[PDB]
Structures are given as C-alpha cells and as structure tokens.
Nucleic acid binder design. Structure first.
Ligand code: SF4
Ligand SMILES: [Mg+2]
Ligand SMILES: [Mg+2]
Ligand SMILES: [Mg+2]
Ligand SMILES: [Mg+2]
Ligand SMILES: [Mg+2]
Ligand SMILES: [Mg+2]
Ligand SMILES: [Mg+2]
Ligand SMILES: [Mg+2]
Ligand SMILES: [Mg+2]
Ligand SMILES: [Mg+2]
Ligand SMILES: [Mg+2]
Ligand SMILES: [Mg+2]
Ligand SMILES: [Mg+2]
Ligand SMILES: [Mg+2]
Ligand SMILES: [Mg+2]
Ligand SMILES: [Mg+2]
Ligand SMILES: [Mg+2]
Ligand SMILES: [Mg+2]
Ligand SMILES: [Mg+2]
Ligand SMILES: [Mg+2]
Ligand SMILES: [Mg+2]
Ligand SMILES: [Mg+2]
Ligand SMILES: [Mg+2]
Ligand SMILES: [Mg+2]
Ligand SMILES: [Mg+2]
Ligand SMILES: [Mg+2]
Ligand SMILES: [Mg+2]
Ligand SMILES: [Mg+2]
Ligand SMILES: [Mg+2]
Ligand SMILES: [Mg+2]
Ligand SMILES: [Mg+2]
Ligand SMILES: [Mg+2]
Ligand SMILES: [Mg+2]
Ligand SMILES: [Mg+2]
Ligand SMILES: [Mg+2]
Ligand SMILES: [Mg+2]
Ligand SMILES: [Mg+2]
Ligand SMILES: [Mg+2]
Ligand SMILES: [Mg+2]
Ligand SMILES: [Mg+2]
Ligand SMILES: [Mg+2]
Ligand SMILES: [Mg+2]
Ligand SMILES: [Mg+2]
Ligand SMILES: [Mg+2]
Ligand SMILES: [Mg+2]
Ligand SMILES: [Mg+2]
Ligand SMILES: [Mg+2]
Ligand SMILES: [Mg+2]
Ligand SMILES: [Mg+2]
Ligand SMILES: [Mg+2]
Ligand SMILES: [Mg+2]
Ligand SMILES: [Mg+2]
Ligand SMILES: [Mg+2]
Ligand SMILES: [Mg+2]
Ligand SMILES: [Mg+2]
Ligand SMILES: [Mg+2]
Ligand SMILES: [Mg+2]
Ligand SMILES: [Mg+2]
Ligand SMILES: [Mg+2]
Ligand SMILES: [Mg+2]
Ligand SMILES: [Mg+2]
Ligand SMILES: [Mg+2]
Ligand SMILES: [Mg+2]
Ligand SMILES: [Mg+2]
Ligand SMILES: [Mg+2]
Ligand SMILES: [Mg+2]
Ligand SMILES: [Mg+2]
Ligand SMILES: [Mg+2]
Ligand SMILES: [Mg+2]
Ligand SMILES: [Mg+2]
Ligand SMILES: [Mg+2]
Ligand SMILES: [Mg+2]
Ligand SMILES: [Mg+2]
Ligand SMILES: [Mg+2]
Ligand SMILES: [Mg+2]
Lengths: 231, 137, 208, 148
RNA sequence: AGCGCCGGCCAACUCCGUGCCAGCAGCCGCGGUAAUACGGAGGGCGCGAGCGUUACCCGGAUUCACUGGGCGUAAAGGGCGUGUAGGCGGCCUGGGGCGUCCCAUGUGAAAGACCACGGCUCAACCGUGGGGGAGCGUGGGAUACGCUCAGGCUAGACGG
RNA sequence: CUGGUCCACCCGUGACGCUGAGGCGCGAAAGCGUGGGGAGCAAACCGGAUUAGAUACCCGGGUAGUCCACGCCCUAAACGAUGCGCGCUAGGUCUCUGGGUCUCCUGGGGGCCGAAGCUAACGCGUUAAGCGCGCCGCCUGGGGAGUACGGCCGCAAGGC
C-alpha cells in the first residue's frame, strides 16, 4: 500500500534546529538542511502500518491530532473518511487525562443540537437566542471532530509530536500508544509507531495521512478510491 | 590518569545512562579480564579489541531491557550499578570467609585473586580471596 | 506479687472476655456480658482513635493479663524467645504455656489459672511424682502432672475433677481422670491455641 | 476491595488580608496484604474529602511488590530528596522492624518480615515516596536472569 | 501495698479550688475567674516489695560519618603561585614474592559469653560437654592486583 | 629587557607524572619609615544649609593622603562566596584568537540556553554544582569571639 517516490513528495527538512535523538533516522545534511534517509522511513511505515492494520480489524479508535496550519485542514478530510475523531483546531488541555469532564462539554454540544432543532421555545428572550447560538458555533469550532470519541482511543496519531507534545504526554500518561509522523525538530523515543518524514509540507502530510486512512478503510470493511488533496 | 579501572567502569556507567550501544576504553590485559566477567555474567553483550588513531581500545557492547510503558519509556539497565571497591587511595582486600554477597545473590563482586579475576561465587568455589575490585548489579 | 485485684475491669478495658474467673465467666452475670465497656467514669464516652503505641500496649497487656503474670517475668520469657531458635512469636506462646500453673489449668484441675496457682502454691500439684509449688516451673514433654495423693480426697479438686470427664483437651496434652493425672506431650503449634491475640503485635511492642 | 491506613493528616495554611485560611493534606497507603500497594497524598478544604481524595489517588498509583515468604528479595537503599530509606531482608521470626511511615507501607503490602532504617530528612511525606520508589525497584532472581 | 504518671512526645479525664498568684517543667510549654498542664478529689494508665528521682556510661546521634556526612547561597575552598616531605600514578614482558590470598601446625590459660545437658522442688546460682574465633610464630604453596628489581613502548608529561 | 599562553608540523625524550603538611615568593586599598612631589580630589578639621536636633547626607573651604623611589605592613564581599589535575556524559546560539579541503570543519579561551544527571530549592549543566579516581585545605548549633591567654611576626597600626 506503501509507494516509494515519497521522494517526490517530502524527504524531510530543517536546518540545525534539530533534536539529536533523531540522529538514527538521518542520511546527510544538504541545503543547510537535515535530509531524511528514506530507506529508514520505509522500514518504519511498514511497522507502523502493521500496528495501524491490527487496530482497524479489531475496530479500535484512533485519535487524530494536528493543528499547525499545514496539517490543519487535511486532518478534517482524512479522519472524517474513517469517521474517527480528531482535533483540527486548538488542543484543549486534559482531553485524554481529563476525558469525562472534557466530554461533559459535548453533551452541551448535543444539547444545543436538540434545542436548536426547534422548538422547545423561541419565546426564550431574543438575545438568549443569539447568545446560545454563538456558544453553539464555538463548541462546534473546537469539538467538531472530538465528539466521535466516546472513550479513550486505543491509539492516537499525531502530525507534529513536538508541536503536540502535550498530546503525546497525555496519551503516554494513560498508556495510549502514540503514532506520529515527525521530522528532525522532534524526539523519536517519545513515539511508539513513527513516520520520520517532513511534517510541514502539505504534500507530505497528504501522502502519509491518506494511505493511513486508505489502510484503515481497506482492512475495516470496504475499499475506496481517491480522496480530496489541495493541489 | 590515576585509576584505569575506575575510569573504565565510569565510561560504562556514563554511557549506559544515555543508552549508547557501545563505548571505548583504553586497553589492558587486566581491564579485559574484567570485561570477560562482565560479559560472561551477561552485564554486557561483550567486547572486542578495536583501534582508534593507532591506539588500542576495548569497544564495549552495552545491553539494556525492553522499551517501557508510561511517560518515560527508557528501558531498565542491565548494569544498574557498578562502583570501585578497592581504590588506589585505599586498597581493600578480603579473605575467603569475608567475601560479600552482592545484592543478596542477584549481583556480583568481581575480585582479583592469585587464581585470576573471579566472582564472589567463583572465588568461594576455588576457596581463595583477594583485592575486591568492584561490585555490579 | 501478681495482680490480685478486681479482675473484671481487666476484661472490660481489653474489650474482650478473658477467662480470668472460671465459672462466672460463662454465665450472663459476667461483667463483659452486662457492660462490655471500659471501667470507670468515662467508659461509655466515645472512644477516640487509639495510637499505634496504644494498640500494641493493649495486645501485650491482654496476653499478659491472661496469664496473671508479672511484667518482668513476661519480659524475661520474651527475651528468652528472641534468643531461641525459630519464630519468636510461636516460641513465646509456647514458653508462656509450659508454666506449671498454666499446664494445670489447661488439664482442667482448676477453673481459673488464678486458682491453678494457689493449687500449685499450696503443693496440691506434683510433677513426675515429686511435689512442686512453683507457679513458674518450666514443664517439658513427658512430664506426669498429678494431683497430690493427700489432696485427691479434697472437696474442691473432686468437684473440679468431676467436671472434666469427656471435655477434650488440646492436642499437645493427654488427661487421665480418676487417676487424677495428665501428661505434657509437646510444645503447642500456634494453631493448637486460639487466644484473642495477634502475637506479632507483641514483638512489635518490644522493639521500640 | 483494599485495606486502608491514614499515615499523615496535617493542616496547612496560607495568608491573606484578614487572616490565615486552611487546607488539609492526607497521606494514605492502601493495600491487599498480598503484594500490592499504593501511596496517595491528597488535599482539600476539609479533612474527610482530603482522605477520600487521598485514597482515590492511592489506587491510581500502585506497585507490585515481589514478596518471598513475607520478606523482600534483596537489600535496597533509596534516596528521595534528602530522605533515605533502607530495606533489608529478614527471616520469619523477625517481624517488621520499622517506623510508622515505612511500616504502614510494608505491612499493607503484605511484608511481614524486614529490617529497615530511616536516614537523612525524616519528613514523613518524603520518607513515604522514598519507600515506594524503593519497593518499585525490587528485582527477583528471575527478573534478573531475564534481563541478562 | 506501695510508688510514679494521666496537655503532646506517652498508656491513662472529670469536678472543685486558685486566677501570670500559688505553683509545674526533660523539651515544646502551662497559670491573667469554665486550666484534661498548678493544688486536692473521684476516676483512669503503668509497674509492684517495690516505684521514682539525681549522677554517670553506650544508644537513639550517618551529630567525627571505616561501615556511614559534608564545604555556590545553610557551618565549611587556603588571597594566589612556586615547591620540600609525604600520599597517589599510563601500556607490554620477565625475575623476586614484601603487601595480598590459601593449606598445614603451635599459640590463642581458667573463669565469662554462645549452643547441649544436668544438679539445687524452679530460677537466680552452679556443674559436665561442645563450638569457634581474630591476632602473632612456624612450615608449604599462589602470583591476578599493589610492591620491588630488570628490559621494552608512546596515548601522560616534557622538548624541537 | 622579560613571563605566561595558543596553533601547526607529528621531528626529539621515554611515565621524566598529579597533588602538595611545612618552607619561599607574590599579594587591591588604607596604613607606616626615609626622601621627593603636590594640579585635581579629599579622611580629619572650619563654616553654610537641611532638620525637632543634624558631630551626617547636600554647599563653600581644607591637611594627611592620593603621585615617585626605596623599605615595611599582609588585610579584604582577596568572590565564581565554587582548591588543583586527569578521564567520561546531547546539543542550540553569540564571541575572542589560531590552523584548515576557509560553504563548512578542527583547536584554545569568554558568555548565554539547554540533554542526561544533580540539587532543599534557588539553580548547576563539556567553563558541572553530572558520573568517577588522586592529593590538599576546610566545617561539626547561635552568642560570647576572631575576643582572652600563650607563642610567632610587625616601627606602629595591627597580623597569624
Ligand atoms: S466474668 Fe469472666 S470473663 Fe466476664 S469479665 Fe469477669 S473474668 Fe472476664
Ligand atoms: Mg516540523
Ligand atoms: Mg569501603
Ligand atoms: Mg520480685
Ligand atoms: Mg501495626
Ligand atoms: Mg529467633
Ligand atoms: Mg483465652
Ligand atoms: Mg481460652
Ligand atoms: Mg532494642
Ligand atoms: Mg516485580
Ligand atoms: Mg528528603
Ligand atoms: Mg543528598
Ligand atoms: Mg533470604
Ligand atoms: Mg523531625
Ligand atoms: Mg512513670
Ligand atoms: Mg513510656
Ligand atoms: Mg493518650
Ligand atoms: Mg491564692
Ligand atoms: Mg476552674
Ligand atoms: Mg503533666
Ligand atoms: Mg491535674
Ligand atoms: Mg530508635
Ligand atoms: Mg557514632
Ligand atoms: Mg548521649
Ligand atoms: Mg566516610
Ligand atoms: Mg551534614
Ligand atoms: Mg557561608
Ligand atoms: Mg579561591
Ligand atoms: Mg596568608
Ligand atoms: Mg615527590
Ligand atoms: Mg609509589
Ligand atoms: Mg602501574
Ligand atoms: Mg612485576
Ligand atoms: Mg609474600
Ligand atoms: Mg589461628
Ligand atoms: Mg577460654
Ligand atoms: Mg534441671
Ligand atoms: Mg563451662
Ligand atoms: Mg563469637
Ligand atoms: Mg610475577
Ligand atoms: Mg621500567
Ligand atoms: Mg603524548
Ligand atoms: Mg615522534
Ligand atoms: Mg603543584
Ligand atoms: Mg604553604
Ligand atoms: Mg599590599
Ligand atoms: Mg597604597
Ligand atoms: Mg597611603
Ligand atoms: Mg608615605
Ligand atoms: Mg559642620
Ligand atoms: Mg546649624
Ligand atoms: Mg557639615
Ligand atoms: Mg566637602
Ligand atoms: Mg574642594
Ligand atoms: Mg590648595
Ligand atoms: Mg605622616
Ligand atoms: Mg597617622
Ligand atoms: Mg566578583
Ligand atoms: Mg577565576
Ligand atoms: Mg573565605
Ligand atoms: Mg589546594
Ligand atoms: Mg572537593
Ligand atoms: Mg574558530
Ligand atoms: Mg582561518
Ligand atoms: Mg583568562
Ligand atoms: Mg567554547
Ligand atoms: Mg570579560
Ligand atoms: Mg545555564
Ligand atoms: Mg531534566
Ligand atoms: Mg556547549
Ligand atoms: Mg550542592
Ligand atoms: Mg559555639
Ligand atoms: Mg588577633
Ligand atoms: Mg581582623
Ligand atoms: Mg597576645
Ligand atoms: Mg585568614
């Protein structure tokens, strides 16, 4: 499922803004830039996917996290397809570590979904209409992919582990295994199942996350063909 | 340099703590014999006589445990603990009846005897004592 | 010597019946039966949490109060046990048990150890023949513990000998009524006794 | 369920205009007397809530102590800050020879026979955690061959 | 049958009297009119022909730290060099065997202590047997490490 | 005239090394002796203000001294409050000074930020306060006291 001209898409980046634990996954340093050994990226995509596979055919949830502008939209796409939860926007603190309390805020999300599905009163004072709606958009704005999550995931997939160290931390505290794509600005040992590739190119984020979803649906019940990529 | 032995053990302790696969220590027909015990007892994968810039070393292949669950995945050590006993500042010598039982059996005491470098267990077996080089677990 | 005073307050303070009298111990006229709360002005006040020290004092005192024994004599035995091979807690109980006056009461010749002393002390008991009036004689395996010949014909021992005819006596002991003579077979395994005592807590008292 | 002991319950305070305002702190150990112990320290505006919270955290933090005839396998020394705890194997009669803090932990853990010593700061809290991390580093003859 | 204690450490709580007084006190501390902390009392806890105080020794005190501590700010780096004695010292090979290690053997009195048993009705006390030891002398051995002597080396050091 | 130090070459020596009780030298300022010198500054000191007062701070004056030679003194927040040497344990950035195949790399030094680890915390972190060996110095509750006595040094002040 794997493809080999990811060279055509990503082969990493970043200058000496590195982390030296990532040494093992590195070929050489060219444009004043850390260049990732693709043959290692390979050994790993495999091992990661083997983990990814076993998780779909047992029907286990995956939490998708990425909020840097690059991976922002493409997680709303690729995760919706597998219908699995995500946070695209802001990563609220304690989403895993304080799940039951965070979630007590989705019942509020649902409660507005009902209360706005009419009527249950519109003789509620005018501003109160306007007020509650604003709240609705707000919840929707962060929680739109989170609600799908009704229990702690059996695993989580992250786009930037550094950028989302909080996430990685919360998972790790819970024993929730962490899969992530990650370039040289990151700490390897911190990831269980790892994709050493560029994490800032919309090209790259695209290849890696898509084939993930494609591998999810394929061993889940079905197969599908192409899904949206911004040119 | 004042204690070649202490130096070796420390080269090891220091490397094991940031999880190096190996580390080089200046070579000696005495340091080797100690490594011969460290490997045989499974504290190290083993050692091989290499060369750096024309000069003899012992490359020492380090061994750890499984990756772990929780926020600190750093594996457990195989050599949790290694320390000089005898020193140049104070030579420490035991007779056979007074060889220590490291860590309640689960650890070893390497010692130098006139029947070669032995462990506590081995020394008791041939029934000799000597300079107590160090302790490992 | 030994305690020699009101003996029901002992039980009440200990929060447990200790069978320190004999007969009245089994009746509903027993003190613990009527007032199962500590002697004196504040017995009914709500107890506040005993301290650890407090706890181990009581368990020690309880064990001691059972045997009517002085604190020294108690200590000297315990220390003996600490020097002696094995589990100290067991050996301690064992040695507490091998006391003549205790042996006698265990073989039923008396209703209370407190009565089993005055018997030994008044020489009505003997061992292997020879008379013994020492409440502290350390009885060994093999010993014949009998009522004195000149005491066989006595109202009280008769009444008390009559009461043992088929009540079974601990696995470490054999008893021959009519013959008025019992026998010390071995030292009690702990199971062989079921005293209301966590004896471990006693060790813990003496290690402070 | 688990057996439960309160080791320390202390009052602290903070200053404000108009006066000191208090808070309570609850050190609790929890165990099955058969090899499973947990330590929890919990704070709240009142005594019982604190004890409850404490007990809660305790269960959320455990360790599997490898007993052996009611004694630990080997000698262990651990420093947590300035506090030090010493744990040392003892044979059957010995009992638990220890101060309250590491006593409560070892008893509710099902340790029945051990020689111990507190060195350095004998602050209860720190001695508590120091005894925990100590237990948590215990290794079995197996554990060791398997490692090596 | 007595003696100490009953604020916390520390096991044992109420009434009266007193009112920063009289007094207690090992440390922290009690007493200024509702004192479990003074004095008496009832009651309770602890030991018992004893209980308590004073003195002194070790302990707790890893608080002189060999076992087993420390020195930026807590007590603690010499104002800085140079250097005497001393302490300590890289890689390789041999000789010696001083340290070191092992075996043998002598010594290591008796009593005491430790384990067994036994005699005084128990015990205390006392007897018989057993187990050893460090440490020193002697004899024989080992030679890894430290030493010493001897011969090599160049990674320390010094020089061009 | 003269010391230290770094680099490159890898040419020479063949462990010639580290530390160092004592000893010896050097040691800011103030101060001291003998002799110079003396513009500015300025203890003491005079006077004006300020102020309740103002033996101060602020203002106007002003002698030692501050400067030179030679000889003394030998202190200090003489501080990084961090003894010296060696070995080992991620990196990022700024900088001084070398040598390179001069993008960049490699030494020696000075800062910052940080991995592991340390640490009571604060913080330290290849310039360790990390992990280790060698040697030295020092601490062991506050005060009394860096005082007394003694000794040694000093012209004295005073120092140890
Ligand atoms: S009656 Fe027997 S048991 Fe009840 S109190 Fe008196 S002695 Fe104790
Ligand atoms: Mg990136
Ligand atoms: Mg030692
Ligand atoms: Mg007496
Ligand atoms: Mg207890
Ligand atoms: Mg015993
Ligand atoms: Mg009973
Ligand atoms: Mg009974
Ligand atoms: Mg004792
Ligand atoms: Mg285990
Ligand atoms: Mg501490
Ligand atoms: Mg410490
Ligand atoms: Mg054992
Ligand atoms: Mg304290
Ligand atoms: Mg008393
Ligand atoms: Mg007491
Ligand atoms: Mg009390
Ligand atoms: Mg009066
Ligand atoms: Mg009153
Ligand atoms: Mg009192
Ligand atoms: Mg009173
Ligand atoms: Mg003690
Ligand atoms: Mg001492
Ligand atoms: Mg003392
Ligand atoms: Mg020491
Ligand atoms: Mg100290
Ligand atoms: Mg200071
Ligand atoms: Mg200095
Ligand atoms: Mg000086
Ligand atoms: Mg010398
Ligand atoms: Mg020498
Ligand atoms: Mg040498
Ligand atoms: Mg030689
Ligand atoms: Mg010799
Ligand atoms: Mg001998
Ligand atoms: Mg003798
Ligand atoms: Mg006898
Ligand atoms: Mg004898
Ligand atoms: Mg002995
Ligand atoms: Mg030789
Ligand atoms: Mg030579
Ligand atoms: Mg060289
Ligand atoms: Mg050359
Ligand atoms: Mg020097
Ligand atoms: Mg000097
Ligand atoms: Mg000067
Ligand atoms: Mg001057
Ligand atoms: Mg001057
Ligand atoms: Mg002058
Ligand atoms: Mg004036
Ligand atoms: Mg005036
Ligand atoms: Mg003036
Ligand atoms: Mg002026
Ligand atoms: Mg002027
Ligand atoms: Mg003038
Ligand atoms: Mg003058
Ligand atoms: Mg003058
Ligand atoms: Mg400075
Ligand atoms: Mg400096
Ligand atoms: Mg100083
Ligand atoms: Mg020095
Ligand atoms: Mg030092
Ligand atoms: Mg440069
Ligand atoms: Mg250049
Ligand atoms: Mg400089
Ligand atoms: Mg530098
Ligand atoms: Mg500068
Ligand atoms: Mg820093
Ligand atoms: Mg850290
Ligand atoms: Mg650096
Ligand atoms: Mg420190
Ligand atoms: Mg003083
Ligand atoms: Mg002076
Ligand atoms: Mg002075
Ligand atoms: Mg003088
Ligand atoms: Mg001085």
């Amino acid at each position: 499922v794997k493809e080999l001209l990811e060279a055509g898409v990503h082969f990493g980046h970043e200058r000496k803004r590195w982390n030296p634990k990532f040494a093992r996954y590195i070929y050489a340093e060219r444009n004043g830039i850390h260049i990732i050994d693709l043959q290692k990226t390979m050994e790993e995509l495999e091992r990661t996917f083997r983990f990814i596979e076993d998780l779909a055919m047992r029907g286990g949830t995956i939490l998708f996290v990425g909020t840097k502008k690059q991976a922002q939209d493409i997680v709303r796409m690729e995760a919706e397809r597998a219908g699995m939860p995500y946070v695209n926007q802001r990563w609220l603190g304690g989403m895993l570590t304080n799940f039951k309390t965070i979630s007590q805020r989705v019942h509020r999300l649902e409660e507005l979904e009902a209360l706005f599905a009419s009527p249950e009163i519109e003789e509620r004072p005018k501003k109160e209409q306007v007020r509650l709606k604003h709240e609705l958009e707000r919840l929707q704005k962060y929680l739109s992919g989170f609600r799908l999550l009704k229990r702690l995931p059996d695993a989580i997939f992250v786009v930037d582990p550094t950028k989302e160290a909080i996430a990685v931390r919360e998972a790790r505290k819970l024993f929730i295994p962490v899969i992530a794509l990650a370039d040289t600005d990151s700490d390897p040992d911190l990831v269980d199942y790892i994709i050493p590739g560029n994490d800032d190119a919309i090209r790259s984020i695209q290849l890696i996350l898509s084939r993930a979803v494609d591998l999810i649906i394929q061993a889940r019940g079905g197969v599908v063909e192409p899904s949206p990529s911004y040119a | 340099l004042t204690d070649p032995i202490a130096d070796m053990l420390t080269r090891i302790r220091n490397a094991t703590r940031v999880y190096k696969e190996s580390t080089d220590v200046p070579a000696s027909r005495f340091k080797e014999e100690i490594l011969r015990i460290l490997a045989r007892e499974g504290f190290i994968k083993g050692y091989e006589r290499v060369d750096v810039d024309g000069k003899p070393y012992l490359r020492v292949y380090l061994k750890y445990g499984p990756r772990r669950q929780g926020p600190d995945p750093r594996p457990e050590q195989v050599i949790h603990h290694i320390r000089r006993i005898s020193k140049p500042g104070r030579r420490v010598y035991v007779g056979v009846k007074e060889i220590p039982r490291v860590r309640r059996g689960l650890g070893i005491a390497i010692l130098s005897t006139s029947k070669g470098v032995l462990t506590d267990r081995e020394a008791r077996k041939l029934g000799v004592g000597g300079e107590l080089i160090c302790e490992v677990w | 010597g030994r305690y020699i005073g009101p003996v029901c307050r002992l039980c009440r303070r200990e929060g447990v019946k200790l069978y320190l009298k004999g007969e009245r111990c089994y009746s509903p006229k027993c003190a613990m039966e009527r007032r199962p709360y500590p002697p004196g002005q504040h017995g009914q006040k709500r107890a506040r949490r005993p301290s650890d020290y407090a706890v181990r004092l009581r368990e020690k005192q309880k064990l001691r109060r059972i045997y009517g024994i002085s604190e020294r004599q108690f200590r000297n035995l315990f220390e003996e046990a600490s020097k002696k091979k094995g589990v100290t807690g067991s050996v301690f109980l064992g040695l507490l048990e091998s006391r003549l006056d205790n042996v006698v009461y265990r073989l039923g010749f008396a209703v209370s150890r407190r009565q089993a002393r005055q018997l030994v002390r008044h020489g009505h008991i003997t061992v292997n023949g020879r008379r013994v009036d020492l409440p502290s004689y350390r009885v060994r395996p093999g010993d014949e513990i009998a009522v004195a010949e000149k005491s066989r014909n006595l109202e009280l021992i008769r009444q008390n000998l009559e009461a043992m005819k088929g009540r079974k006596v601990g696995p470490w002991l054999s008893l021959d009524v009519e013959g008025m003579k019992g026998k010390f077979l071995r030292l009690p395994d702990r199971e062989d006794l079921a005293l209301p005592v966590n004896e471990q807590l006693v060790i813990e008292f003496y290690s402070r | 369920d688990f057996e439960e002991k309160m080791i320390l319950i202390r009052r602290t305070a903070r200053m404000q205009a108009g006066g000191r305002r208090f808070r309570f702190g609850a050190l609790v150990v929890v165990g099955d007397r058969q090899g499973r112990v947990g330590l929890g320290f919990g704070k709240a505006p009142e005594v019982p809530l604190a004890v409850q919270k404490a007990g809660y955290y305790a269960r959320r933090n455990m360790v599997e102590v490898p007993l052996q005839n009611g004694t630990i396998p080997h000698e262990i020394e651990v420093e947590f800050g300035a506090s030090k705890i010493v744990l040392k194997p003892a044979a059957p009669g010995t009992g638990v020879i220890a101060g309250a803090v590491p006593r409560a932990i070892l008893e509710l853990a099902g340790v029945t026979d051990i020689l111990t010593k507190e060195l350095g700061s004998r602050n209860p809290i720190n001695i508590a955690y120091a005894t925990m991390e100590a237990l948590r580093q215990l290794r079995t003859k197996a554990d060791v061959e398997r490692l090596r």
